[PDB]
Amino acid sequence: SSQAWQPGVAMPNLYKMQRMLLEKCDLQNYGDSATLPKGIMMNVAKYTQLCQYLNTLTLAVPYNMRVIHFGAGSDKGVAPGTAVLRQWLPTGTLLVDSDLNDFVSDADSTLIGDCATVHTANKWDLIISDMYDPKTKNVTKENDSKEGFFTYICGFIQQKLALGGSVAIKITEHSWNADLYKLMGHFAWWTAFVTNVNASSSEAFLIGCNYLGKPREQIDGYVMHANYIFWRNTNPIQLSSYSLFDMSKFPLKLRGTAVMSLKEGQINDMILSLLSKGRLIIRENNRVVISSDVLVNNENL
Amino acid sequence: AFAVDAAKAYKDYLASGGQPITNCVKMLCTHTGTGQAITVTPEANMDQESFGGASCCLYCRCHIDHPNPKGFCDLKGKYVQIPTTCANDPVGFTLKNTVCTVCGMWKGYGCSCDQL
Ligand SMILES: Nc1ncnc2c1ncn2[C@@H]1O[C@H](COP(=O)(O)OP(=O)(O)OP(=O)(O)O)[C@@H](O)[C@H]1O
Ligand SMILES: [Cl-]
Numbered sequence: 001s002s003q004a005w006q007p008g009v010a011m012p013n014l015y016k017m018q019r020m021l022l023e024k025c026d027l028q029n030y031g032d033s034a035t036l037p038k039g040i041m042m043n044v045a046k047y048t049q050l051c052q053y054l055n056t057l058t059l060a061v062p063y064n065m066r067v068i069h070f071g072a073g074s075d076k077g078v079a080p081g082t083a084v085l086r087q088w089l090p091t092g093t094l095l096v097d098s099d100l101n102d103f104v105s106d107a108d109s110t111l112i113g114d115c116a117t118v119h120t121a122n123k124w125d126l127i128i129s130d131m132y133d134p135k136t137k138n139v140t141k142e143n144d145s146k147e148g149f150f151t152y153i154c155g156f157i158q159q160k161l162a163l164g165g166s167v168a169i170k171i172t173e174h175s176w177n178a179d180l181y182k183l184m185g186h187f188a189w190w191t192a193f194v195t196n197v198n199a200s201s202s203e204a205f206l207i208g209c210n211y212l213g214k215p216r217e218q219i220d221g222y223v224m225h226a227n228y229i230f231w232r233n234t235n236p237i238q239l240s241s242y243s244l245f246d247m248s249k250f251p252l253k254l255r256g257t258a259v260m261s262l263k264e265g266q267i268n269d270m271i272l273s274l275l276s277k278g279r280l281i282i283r284e285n286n287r288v289v290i291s292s293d294v295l296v297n298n299e300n301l
Numbered sequence: 302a303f304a305v306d307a308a309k310a311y312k313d314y315l316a317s318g319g320q321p322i323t324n325c326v327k328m329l330c331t332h333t334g335t336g337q338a339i340t341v342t343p344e345a346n347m348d349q350e351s352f353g354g355a356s357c358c359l360y361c362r363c364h365i366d367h368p369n370p371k372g373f374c375d376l377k378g379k380y381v382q383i384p385t386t387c388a389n390d391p392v393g394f395t396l397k398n399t400v401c402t403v404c405g406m407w408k409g410y411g412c413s414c415d416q417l
């Protein structure tokens with residue numbers, strides 16, 4: 001009941017352990033809306049609560065942290081989520097963001113185009129994705145695992161997420177991917193987190209906490225998404241803005257988490273233990289370089 | 302010898318009665334901050350709102366070159382504190398006002414250097 005004073009509600013472990021069948025999502029509090037503080041955007045509120053929840057986890061927070069944010073633009077041409085992330089992250093954190101459409105951002109670098117065109121030399125400590133296509137809300141069509149940018153995100157995690165890093169990837173009833181759930185089992189811990197300000201939506205953030213680069217746990221992602229919808233269907237979440245009014249403990253603590261480079265042969269149970277506790281990041285510490293593929297075409301005839 | 306005067310155009314558009322640029326990104330914060338004008342993290346005091354800087358920059362918002370010869374932006378990547386009374390037009394406010402280079406407060410909205 002004290003849930004209304006939390007930033008949101010994470011999917012309880014017992015629901016992760018079920019074997020439910022996929023059903024349609026019918027939220028009792030649909031259409032309900034939280035009362036946002038005067039002049040505050042939904043996305044500022046939503047990202048603030050996401051970050052407040054991430055503050056309760058064992059995130060690795062190194063010096064010279066690297067964070068990349070996908071789906072960061074808005075139909076407004078600005079980047080509210082990026083502004084919250086930059087507020088939350090320690091000053092100096094390297095923040096790159098990206099979106100299909102042009103937008104102006106507070107990130108250190110912004111790449112415009114489909115996410116599949118984004119390449120980076122380096123590995124990242126945290127990956128945030130708000131990517132979404134509202135065309136998936138079609139209730140007249142079967143709800144199958146989606147590909148598109150989810151295929152990119154899965155490969156990007158497996159290829160460019162530092163060991164010890166974390167992710168928060170936006171999903172909904174229809175915007176989801178089975179392999180991404182399966183990949184949640186490659187972290188020390190995972191959940192599906194629902195913000196209290198947007199609790200009338202089937203949106204959640206799939207959070208993978210402290211990447212291990214190998215399966216710790218075998219997850220069937222079709223079943224796990226059915227489990228998520230089952231949870232949402234039977235646990236109405238009361239819309240709430242409360243947590244927005246107390247920002248005194250908002251900043252992410254600069255833990256100075258250690259960064260080492262290591263080869264796959266050196267990752268032993270002791271290293272894996274440190275990774276799982278948020279006390280180690282494994283990646284090169286070189287300069288951060290990114291790029292966007294540009295397709296070249298001459299349409300003159 | 303020809304350059305567009307976006308600054309002057311916005312000022313005249315405002316004077317003529319146009320609606321201020323909207324969708325400046327207002328931050329949640331304690332509002333117990335230092336009140337300095339432009340900061341690495343929100344610093345609104347009781348009498349200010351804090352906004353993401355890029356969204357309050359006329360040049361950023363209009364997709365035009367910054368008056369800096371290096372083209373560098375004062376606001377992008379930081380947070381700008383706007384007096385609550387002026388929070389209806391953060392782009393106008395940052396355009397029209399200047400930051401005291403000594404104490405970091407807005408001249409005429411917190412800067413007291415010229416009173417001792
Ligand atoms: N494949 C993709 N590559 C990059 N960005 C993407 C991709 N698919 C979706 N996005 C971006 O993800 C964001 C999703 O935001 P949102 O949930 O608000 O949906 P939307 O209705 O498309 O956007 P908005 O209403 O904010 O303009 C959009 O800014 C969109 O451009
Ligand atoms: Cl499972």
Ligand SMILES: [Cl-]
Pocket residue numbers: 322362363
């Ligand atoms: Cl504009």
Ligand SMILES: [Zn+2]
Pocket residue numbers: 355358359360361362367374375376377
């Ligand atoms: Zn600017």
Ligand SMILES: [Zn+2]
Pocket residue numbers: 401402403404405406412413414415
């Ligand atoms: Zn002064």
